[PDB]
Design an enzyme around this catalytic site. Structure first.
Site, PDB file in Angstrom:
ATOM      1  N   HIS A   1       0.896  -1.198   0.000  1.00 36.22           N
ATOM      2  CA  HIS A   1       0.000   0.000   0.000  1.00 36.22           C
ATOM      3  C   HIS A   1       0.902   1.207   0.000  1.00 36.22           C
ATOM      4  O   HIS A   1       1.761   1.336   0.907  1.00 36.22           O
ATOM      5  CB  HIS A   1      -0.879  -0.055   1.245  1.00 36.22           C
ATOM      6  CG  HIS A   1      -2.000  -1.075   1.121  1.00 36.22           C
ATOM      7  ND1 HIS A   1      -2.445  -1.845   2.186  1.00 36.22           N
ATOM      8  CD2 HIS A   1      -2.730  -1.467   0.054  1.00 36.22           C
ATOM      9  CE1 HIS A   1      -3.430  -2.637   1.779  1.00 36.22           C
ATOM     10  NE2 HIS A   1      -3.600  -2.451   0.483  1.00 36.22           N
ATOM     11  N   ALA A   2       0.649   2.095  -0.958  1.00 34.83           N
ATOM     12  CA  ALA A   2       1.657   3.188  -1.309  1.00 34.83           C
ATOM     13  C   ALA A   2       1.932   4.093  -0.112  1.00 34.83           C
ATOM     14  O   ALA A   2       3.064   4.441   0.156  1.00 34.83           O
ATOM     15  CB  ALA A   2       1.156   3.978  -2.416  1.00 34.83           C
ATOM     16  N   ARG A   3       0.889   4.472   0.616  1.00 32.00           N
ATOM     17  CA  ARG A   3       1.102   5.451   1.678  1.00 32.00           C
ATOM     18  C   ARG A   3       1.713   4.901   2.984  1.00 32.00           C
ATOM     19  O   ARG A   3       2.002   5.704   3.916  1.00 32.00           O
ATOM     20  CB  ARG A   3      -0.263   6.110   2.000  1.00 32.00           C
ATOM     21  CG  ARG A   3      -1.317   5.108   2.614  1.00 32.00           C
ATOM     22  CD  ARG A   3      -2.692   5.713   2.580  1.00 32.00           C
ATOM     23  NE  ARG A   3      -3.799   4.799   2.993  1.00 32.00           N
ATOM     24  CZ  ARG A   3      -5.058   5.134   2.871  1.00 32.00           C
ATOM     25  NH1 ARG A   3      -5.372   6.320   2.331  1.00 32.00           N
ATOM     26  NH2 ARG A   3      -5.999   4.309   3.336  1.00 32.00           N
ATOM     27  N   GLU A   4       1.891   3.578   3.105  1.00 32.49           N
ATOM     28  CA  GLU A   4       2.343   3.005   4.346  1.00 32.49           C
ATOM     29  C   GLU A   4       3.866   2.993   4.379  1.00 32.49           C
ATOM     30  O   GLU A   4       4.471   1.945   4.348  1.00 32.49           O
ATOM     31  CB  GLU A   4       1.834   1.551   4.473  1.00 32.49           C
ATOM     32  CG  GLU A   4       0.300   1.615   4.768  1.00 32.49           C
ATOM     33  CD  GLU A   4      -0.479   0.343   4.480  1.00 32.49           C
ATOM     34  OE1 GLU A   4       0.118  -0.732   4.524  1.00 32.49           O
ATOM     35  OE2 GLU A   4      -1.715   0.421   4.248  1.00 32.49           O
TER      36      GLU A   4
ATOM     37  N   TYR B   1      -1.254   1.034   9.423  1.00 33.85           N
ATOM     38  CA  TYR B   1      -0.807   1.000  10.809  1.00 33.85           C
ATOM     39  C   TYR B   1      -1.874   0.283  11.656  1.00 33.85           C
ATOM     40  O   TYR B   1      -2.936  -0.053  11.150  1.00 33.85           O
ATOM     41  CB  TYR B   1      -0.626   2.471  11.347  1.00 33.85           C
ATOM     42  CG  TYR B   1      -1.957   3.254  11.277  1.00 33.85           C
ATOM     43  CD1 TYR B   1      -2.318   3.961  10.134  1.00 33.85           C
ATOM     44  CD2 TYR B   1      -2.794   3.309  12.384  1.00 33.85           C
ATOM     45  CE1 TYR B   1      -3.528   4.682  10.061  1.00 33.85           C
ATOM     46  CE2 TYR B   1      -3.987   4.002  12.341  1.00 33.85           C
ATOM     47  CZ  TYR B   1      -4.343   4.695  11.182  1.00 33.85           C
ATOM     48  OH  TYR B   1      -5.528   5.398  11.158  1.00 33.85           O
TER      49      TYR B   1
ATOM     50  N   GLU C   1       1.007  -5.208  10.972  1.00 32.72           N
ATOM     51  CA  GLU C   1       0.605  -3.813  10.822  1.00 32.72           C
ATOM     52  C   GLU C   1       1.452  -3.050  11.844  1.00 32.72           C
ATOM     53  O   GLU C   1       1.357  -3.293  13.079  1.00 32.72           O
ATOM     54  CB  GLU C   1      -0.880  -3.636  11.217  1.00 32.72           C
ATOM     55  CG  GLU C   1      -1.885  -4.313  10.191  1.00 32.72           C
ATOM     56  CD  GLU C   1      -2.074  -3.487   8.928  1.00 32.72           C
ATOM     57  OE1 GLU C   1      -1.497  -2.385   8.917  1.00 32.72           O
ATOM     58  OE2 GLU C   1      -2.694  -3.965   7.886  1.00 32.72           O
TER      59      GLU C   1
ATOM     60  N   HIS D   1       2.689  -4.129   6.626  1.00 37.83           N
ATOM     61  CA  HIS D   1       1.775  -3.022   6.370  1.00 37.83           C
ATOM     62  C   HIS D   1       1.860  -2.024   7.572  1.00 37.83           C
ATOM     63  O   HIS D   1       2.607  -2.247   8.510  1.00 37.83           O
ATOM     64  CB  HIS D   1       0.323  -3.534   6.329  1.00 37.83           C
ATOM     65  CG  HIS D   1       0.001  -4.298   5.070  1.00 37.83           C
ATOM     66  ND1 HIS D   1      -0.734  -3.736   4.043  1.00 37.83           N
ATOM     67  CD2 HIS D   1       0.346  -5.545   4.662  1.00 37.83           C
ATOM     68  CE1 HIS D   1      -0.844  -4.622   3.058  1.00 37.83           C
ATOM     69  NE2 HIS D   1      -0.174  -5.711   3.395  1.00 37.83           N
TER      70      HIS D   1
ATOM     71  N   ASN E   1      -3.987  -5.778  -2.024  1.00 40.15           N
ATOM     72  CA  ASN E   1      -4.326  -6.737  -1.004  1.00 40.15           C
ATOM     73  C   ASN E   1      -5.784  -7.084  -0.969  1.00 40.15           C
ATOM     74  O   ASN E   1      -6.294  -7.619   0.059  1.00 40.15           O
ATOM     75  CB  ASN E   1      -3.819  -6.288   0.402  1.00 40.15           C
ATOM     76  CG  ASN E   1      -3.437  -7.498   1.254  1.00 40.15           C
ATOM     77  OD1 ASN E   1      -2.892  -8.479   0.714  1.00 40.15           O
ATOM     78  ND2 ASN E   1      -3.758  -7.457   2.563  1.00 40.15           N
ATOM     79  N   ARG E   2      -6.456  -6.805  -2.102  1.00 40.40           N
ATOM     80  CA  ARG E   2      -7.767  -7.356  -2.304  1.00 40.40           C
ATOM     81  C   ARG E   2      -7.751  -8.131  -3.651  1.00 40.40           C
ATOM     82  O   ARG E   2      -8.808  -8.479  -4.145  1.00 40.40           O
ATOM     83  CB  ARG E   2      -8.803  -6.236  -2.336  1.00 40.40           C
ATOM     84  CG  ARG E   2      -8.972  -5.500  -0.983  1.00 40.40           C
ATOM     85  CD  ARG E   2      -9.480  -6.377   0.212  1.00 40.40           C
ATOM     86  NE  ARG E   2      -9.681  -5.496   1.371  1.00 40.40           N
ATOM     87  CZ  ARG E   2      -8.660  -5.083   2.118  1.00 40.40           C
ATOM     88  NH1 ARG E   2      -7.397  -5.516   1.823  1.00 40.40           N
ATOM     89  NH2 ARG E   2      -8.862  -4.285   3.169  1.00 40.40           N
TER      90      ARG E   2
ATOM     91  N   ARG F   1      -3.228   4.880  -1.869  1.00 38.80           N
ATOM     92  CA  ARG F   1      -3.144   3.464  -1.386  1.00 38.80           C
ATOM     93  C   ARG F   1      -2.901   2.433  -2.459  1.00 38.80           C
ATOM     94  O   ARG F   1      -2.051   1.511  -2.338  1.00 38.80           O
ATOM     95  CB  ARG F   1      -4.465   3.126  -0.672  1.00 38.80           C
ATOM     96  CG  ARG F   1      -4.640   1.675  -0.201  1.00 38.80           C
ATOM     97  CD  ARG F   1      -6.106   1.553   0.330  1.00 38.80           C
ATOM     98  NE  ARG F   1      -6.460   0.177   0.601  1.00 38.80           N
ATOM     99  CZ  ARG F   1      -6.182  -0.489   1.728  1.00 38.80           C
ATOM    100  NH1 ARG F   1      -5.396   0.050   2.667  1.00 38.80           N
ATOM    101  NH2 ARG F   1      -6.603  -1.756   1.885  1.00 38.80           N
TER     102      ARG F   1
ATOM    103  N   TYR G   1     -10.579  -6.857  10.581  1.00 34.01           N
ATOM    104  CA  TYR G   1     -11.940  -6.864   9.912  1.00 34.01           C
ATOM    105  C   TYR G   1     -11.881  -7.946   8.834  1.00 34.01           C
ATOM    106  O   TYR G   1     -10.766  -8.345   8.459  1.00 34.01           O
ATOM    107  CB  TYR G   1     -12.268  -5.510   9.177  1.00 34.01           C
ATOM    108  CG  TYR G   1     -11.107  -4.800   8.525  1.00 34.01           C
ATOM    109  CD1 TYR G   1     -10.420  -5.350   7.452  1.00 34.01           C
ATOM    110  CD2 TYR G   1     -10.681  -3.513   8.988  1.00 34.01           C
ATOM    111  CE1 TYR G   1      -9.282  -4.674   6.905  1.00 34.01           C
ATOM    112  CE2 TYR G   1      -9.611  -2.829   8.421  1.00 34.01           C
ATOM    113  CZ  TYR G   1      -8.922  -3.402   7.380  1.00 34.01           C
ATOM    114  OH  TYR G   1      -7.870  -2.697   6.836  1.00 34.01           O
TER     115      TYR G   1
HETATM  116 ZN   LIG Z   1      -2.999  -1.186   7.338  1.00 42.77          ZN
HETATM  117 ZN   LIG Z   2      -1.644  -1.894   4.092  1.00 44.05          ZN
END
Ligand SMILES: [Zn+2]
Ligand SMILES: [Zn+2]
Ligand SMILES: [Zn+2]
Ligand SMILES: [Zn+2]
Ligand SMILES: [Zn+2]
Ligand SMILES: [Zn+2]
Ligand SMILES: [Zn+2]
Length: 304
Positions: A64-67, A194, A266, A192, A139-140, A122, A244
């Protein structure tokens, strides 16, 4: 101008993959496992002393780009391996006996975009039929309860599952690499942020892996080990009830291929900075996460 204690742009991390390989030829080799939507090479580092019939642990960062703390972590892991090989008994035994495939950034196009246009991006940067909205959630995008729960069918949404499982060049390249190396790869780790969690399967349905007790015990001890350093508190458990339900995750997919030790990390924090975790926290976050990763590695090695 690379540093392990700052966030590096893609140009810098790419040059670092080349230089860290060149600097440590007895421990590191580099390959590209495919190209991204935009045509960037997806680099992979194989970290380990050569040897016959070695088992492997696979770890990726930057789905995920922003992580950004995730991308910083895979670089820190490599940092530790080359720095401490010969001096720390455990890391030395790990690198002698197993290989680590370390994929520093999977979603390079999204990562470049967070540096150039939109820090909070993301998804990937591929196009979608019928809309101008951009990107799939990698990740989906795996074939694991694909597009059934906790994933969106709208291409304009942040958890869009894509047009088909493995529709993205990047997830196809990762799934192909893992399939092609399945007999050697004994554990799968995906980093990943957070929220301070260690998650294991399943996320795509409320169901439990055959070895749930073994995973639960392992995640529990890894969280305990992590906390030893700075007291940082992590939760753990099966993804669907720990964070989730979310279908199409790479950890669930890898576990369904037979990889028995499959975990999502995470990292920090719990929302104060969230994805914009300051550079001043890179060192503490990486050092404590190293404890959990080395705990898991030690376990895998001891239970082959
Ligand atoms: Zn996350
Ligand atoms: Zn992530
Ligand atoms: Zn450097
Ligand atoms: Zn150097
Ligand atoms: Zn390039
Ligand atoms: Zn031993
Ligand atoms: Zn250290």
């Amino acid at each position: 101008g690379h540093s392990y204690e700052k966030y590096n742009n893609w140009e810098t991390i790419e040059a670092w993959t080349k230089q860290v390989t060149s600097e440590n030829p007895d421990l590191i080799s580099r390959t590209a496992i495919g190209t991204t939507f935009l045509g960037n090479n997806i680099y992979l580092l194989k970290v380990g002393k050569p040897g016959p019939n070695k088992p492997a642990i696979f770890m990726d960062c930057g789905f995920h780009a922003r992580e950004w703390i995730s991308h910083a972590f895979c670089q820190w892991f490599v940092r530790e391996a080359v720095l401490t090989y010969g001096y720390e008994s455990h890391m030395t035994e790990f690198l002698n006996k197993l290989d680590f495939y370390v994929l520093p950034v999977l979603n390079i196009d999204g990562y470049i975009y967070t540096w150039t246009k939109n820090r909070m991006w993301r998804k990937t940067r591929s196009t979608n039929a019928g809309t101008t909205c951009i990107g799939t959630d990698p990740n989906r995008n795996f074939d694991a309860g694909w597009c059934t729960t906790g994933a969106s069918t709208d291409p304009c949404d942040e958890t869009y599952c894509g047009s088909a499982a493995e529709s993205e060049k990047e997830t196809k390249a990762l799934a192909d690499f893992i399939r092609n190396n399945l007999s050697s790869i004994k554990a799968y780790l995906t980093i990943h942020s957070y929220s301070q969690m260690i998650l294991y399967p399943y996320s795509y349905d409320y169901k439990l892996p055959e070895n749930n007790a073994e995973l639960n015990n392992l995640a529990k001890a890894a969280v305990k080990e992590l906390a030893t350093l700075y007291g940082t508190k992590y939760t753990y458990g099966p993804g669907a009830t720990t964070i989730y339900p979310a279908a199409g995750g790479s950890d669930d997919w890898a576990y369904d291929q037979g990889i028995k030790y499959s975990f999502t990390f995470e990292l920090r924090d719990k929302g104060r900075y969230g994805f914009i975790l300051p550079e001043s926290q890179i060192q503490a976050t990486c050092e404590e996460t190293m404890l959990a990763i080395k705990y898991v590695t030690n376990y895998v090695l001891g239970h082959l």
